[PDB]
Design a binder for this molecule. Structure first.
Ligand SMILES: NC(=O)c1ccc[n+]([C@@H]2O[C@H](COP(=O)([O-])OP(=O)(O)OC[C@H]3O[C@@H](n4cnc5c(N)ncnc54)[C@H](O)[C@@H]3O)[C@@H](O)[C@H]2O)c1
Ligand SMILES: NC(=O)c1ccc[n+]([C@@H]2O[C@H](COP(=O)([O-])OP(=O)(O)OC[C@H]3O[C@@H](n4cnc5c(N)ncnc54)[C@H](O)[C@@H]3O)[C@@H](O)[C@H]2O)c1
Lengths: 410, 410, 304
């Protein structure tokens, strides 16, 4: 179950199918740089608490590295190293001039005050500033970090520099150089990939039977988005149960009666199980709940033409192979959710020029990137007769392998 | 700064204006009981996790205490204490035979399965059963809890009793003794207070000018209600702007353009600002969005005869003094939102009798309870020449202080 | 033939058409608790006779259980089990906060004296008291039991409690907390399903139609009102006696009548709807409305 060694296997199988040699795996199986730091913080009670921080930079062969920072009690070195590698793949799937980066601090932010989080954000930037910046390694928001933390981190970096460096970090508030169209960008990308998968199977959304798992932020918005496309949303589900209407659920009713924590099954008596919801006959199954939802146990039972992953990691390895050889078009999470990294990149470009796009322009620019990435992965999947996940990994890693070779590193 | 100490300040000022001694505040400033439990739960991986739970019972002078149980990572002992005191004030305002209670468990329900939450729910009932029950302390839903969690807790308690105790806990499924007429109880309650405030100012609702700020859950509901009663809803808003039509905005058409975050403004961009929305001349202004919308800078320029808080804290203290000085009838949020507690109470009564009311009967009784509360707070404010928020507080504490004296506790 | 297996298949068909799976039938096909007792009674000639008694509590997922007590030479464990399950269904149809219960003593009341019957009635309450009472299991009259039997069992329970618990047992005399409108109740129930049948065959509560005759009558577009629905006035007024006992407040015949009509009204439009929207006979639609609430409760509470 170890993430990092599992991530290495992803890189190894993709470099190996691309035809690169053992030397190339050895170069890419670990970050080029990993910086571990100890950040003293003056806490609100006057004691100094010392926090462990990490910043991984996987490969900068293609450009500066990119990836967010998370504040979690369970952050580890192996976690940060693995996710920096996943960032490399995410950037390449959508063709950014970026290698993968990642940072983490071991702390419980929910147990710290405003002033403590700011002082820890500043001390983090102080601790790593020698290897980061607009041209080296660009952090961004992640678990338990948000625009205010990006704003403190930017101010600290810019004071050290003696000038404004908004391109240091992405996810900034608008007034600090943030990018319009940033909040919806991941979900909008799932919307493009859904509509692009539908064309590949010549499935008209209007009247198509679609079931989505989950009814929180991702699931609310995806059930509403397909209901307004005229599609029939015959199933939605909760942590507590699921709903099924062969004629299509009244999404606007559920939407109205849901509570602020993504639950709505609870109001209802007639209720079906999540496991039965996944096995419903439908055109588009969209898992938007949680991981390991389609497994070797139900992979032969799901009868959807298209499965777009909105949750992270909802299909297991053996289930992915079972789905592809049943003809099902599986769009992997690492492609479906690439809208967030793409708009991070747009923010950094705006900071480089000093000129800022309108929302309609970011959307236009965001749409083509997704439309183009989907086609790159789909074409690699079908040309090489592989599942779209491995094809996505291959598209994800090949720029870094090509650049590493050209620059003389292998 | 802090909610508990801020809640202590509210109880102190109310008891002071009612005329009690310093002893009465010494009795009421902290809950009579506070139970902190540790709950071990078997997790799905087989390990054991030990969770922290709290149950606060503010004052049982008037009857058993009443209040919900929240499952949140940010639950704290001071928060549970302070909210129990708020439940006393609520139960007082609407004249229930209850005192204030509340619970909380420090967990992240988002990282827990359905089985983990059930076992935690049963372990919490087990851990506090000695001091709660139909006649002692009656819990209910709150943040991250729901009718399924109430069903589990009611089952655990009944198992412990060796007989069915539906009145232990409210928010139950109907098949386990919950109340009809519950789902929109809080929103119906604001609707009653708006109409009753309107008749005080001798305003015909059937042609009145209504401005609502916010267009999510509450704003969308209030707007359709006012639209139906014949009111002209001349303004609505969301986070991105506001719409204005002097003759009525056509709510049914707007409720169809909603995007699942409760946004409608982006589609028009012949839009007015939130600031201007709030100062439009009208009869009934209803801030049903965020907080601190009516402030010292705002309040001199609001033009509504009546302001009904349908969100928590949208009017500041400075602003509250001003609207009272300008002769605007302000309905505080602690009063306008009391319908959820009222219908909680009706579920408990029906449990006591073993007899259950139709939707219509629950509605009739809810109206009379909300009218009587509005009338009681209006008479305290008008008789003492004070603002309605301080009057609401005073009605809310009055019964507990009168009962505490009568039973000899002070 | 055997009432019990016959009733198990009734539950089985209704559960399966409502969509639950086998585990709900496994929970609901036998009672959660069945208590068999031996009651020593002193007879008039100074001898001791020992009697067998049963109490069946089918399911309390919805609330305390409810059903009558019969004194009969042919009382049997299977009869008592099966009849408590019919109580679940009768309560479900009128939408009562009750599960099904039933009890019986194997005895010949006609060959017993008044004194003997009282000493038996008391020994029954003492035998089963640990699992009965106004919040757990509420008995009542049935074959060869009546108000006087109920008064003796109520008095024995109260004595054991050290306080009056009228809510223990229904069919009590008025002066002991019984309900007005009771003697008419079951008859009025039929009188009311007849009247809503207007907007037509109404059964006589024993079980007078065979499986195939209900198939022929329904396929001929003739409306049928099953026994388990039309007889439900008795269970309804029973519930009203309990609620009045819970309050300590007692209604006039007029009000007991208004509330009985409303209940039989809704119970007819629930079975009628269920037969029209699913194109089934009303008897099967009645078993479904009867077992529905108990099924959903067992599911919410975590039992299956
Ligand atoms: N916009 C996107 O598509 C997007 C972006 C980022 C992440 N995600 C992923 O989507 C998933 C949900 O994200 P979110 O913001 O909607 O979360 P959320 O917490 O707001 O909503 C989660 C939903 O999943 C349900 N759920 C939880 N456990 C479940 C279970 N075992 N079975 C079924 N349903 C269950 C919850 O009850 C709720 O309805 C996560 O895996 C996350 O990584 C999606
Ligand atoms: N999850 C939590 O921690 C949490 C916290 C507070 C409340 N809640 C719950 O959330 C629900 C809130 O109901 P609601 O009716 O407020 O719905 P909502 O939050 O779904 O929508 C609120 C509306 O206000 C709008 N809005 C936001 N900022 C605005 C601004 N500055 N000016 C004008 N409009 C603005 C939103 O766009 C939307 O139209 C309640 O159930 C409440 O108990 C949850």
């Amino acid at each position: 179950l170890n993430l990092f060694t599992s991530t290495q296997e992803v890189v190894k199988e993709a470099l190996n199918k691309l035809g690169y040699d053992e030397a190339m795996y050895e170069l890419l199986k670990e970050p080029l740089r990993l910086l571990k730091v100890r950040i003293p913080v003056k806490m609100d009670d006057g004691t100094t608490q010392v926090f462990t921080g990490y910043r991984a930079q996987h490969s900068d062969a293609v450009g500066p590295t990119k990836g967010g920072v998370r504040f979690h009690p369970m952050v580890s070195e192996d976690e940060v190293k693995a996710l920096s590698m996943w960032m490399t793949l995410k950037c390449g799937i959508v063709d950014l001039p970026y290698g993968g980066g990642k940072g983490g601090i071991i702390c419980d932010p929910r147990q710290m005050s405003m002033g403590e989080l700011e002082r820890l954000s500043r001390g983090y930037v102080r601790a790593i500033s020698q290897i980061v910046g607009p041209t080296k390694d660009i952090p961004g928001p992640d678990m338990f970090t948000n625009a205010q933390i990006m704003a403190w981190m930017m101010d600290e970096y810019s004071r050290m520099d003696e000038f404004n460096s908004p391109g240091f970090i992405t996810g900034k508030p608008l007034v600090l150089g943030g990018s319009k169209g940033r909040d919806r960008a991941t979900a909008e990308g799932v919307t493009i990939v859904i509509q692009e998968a539908a064309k590949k199977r010549n499935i008209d959304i209007k009247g198509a039977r679609v079931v989505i798992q989950g009814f929180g932020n991702a699931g609310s918005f995806l059930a509403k988005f397909m209901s307004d496309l005229g599609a029939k949303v015959i199933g939605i589900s909760d942590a507590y149960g699921a709903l099924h209407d062969p004629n299509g659920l009244d999404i606007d009713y559920l939407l109205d009666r849901r509570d602020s924590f993504g639950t709505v099954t609870t109001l209802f008596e007639n209720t079906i199980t999540n496991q039965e919801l996944l096995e419903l006959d439908c055109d588009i199954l969209v898992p938007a709940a949680i991981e390991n939802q389609i497994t070797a146990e139900n992979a032969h039972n799901i009868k959807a033409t298209i499965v777009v992953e909105a949750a992270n990691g909802p299909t297991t390895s053996e289930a992915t192979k079972i789905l592809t050889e049943r003809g099902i078009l599986l769009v992997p999470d690492v492609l479906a959710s690439a809208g967030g990294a793409t708009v991070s990149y747009f923010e950094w470009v705006q900071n480089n020029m000093g000129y800022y796009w309108e929302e309609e322009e970011v959307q236009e620019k965001l749409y083509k990137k997704m439309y183009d990435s989907f086609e790159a992965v789909y074409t690699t999947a079908t040309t090489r007769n592989i599942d779209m996940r491995l094809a996505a990994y291959m598209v994800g890693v090949r720029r870094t392998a090509e650049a590493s070779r050209f620059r003389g590193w292998v």
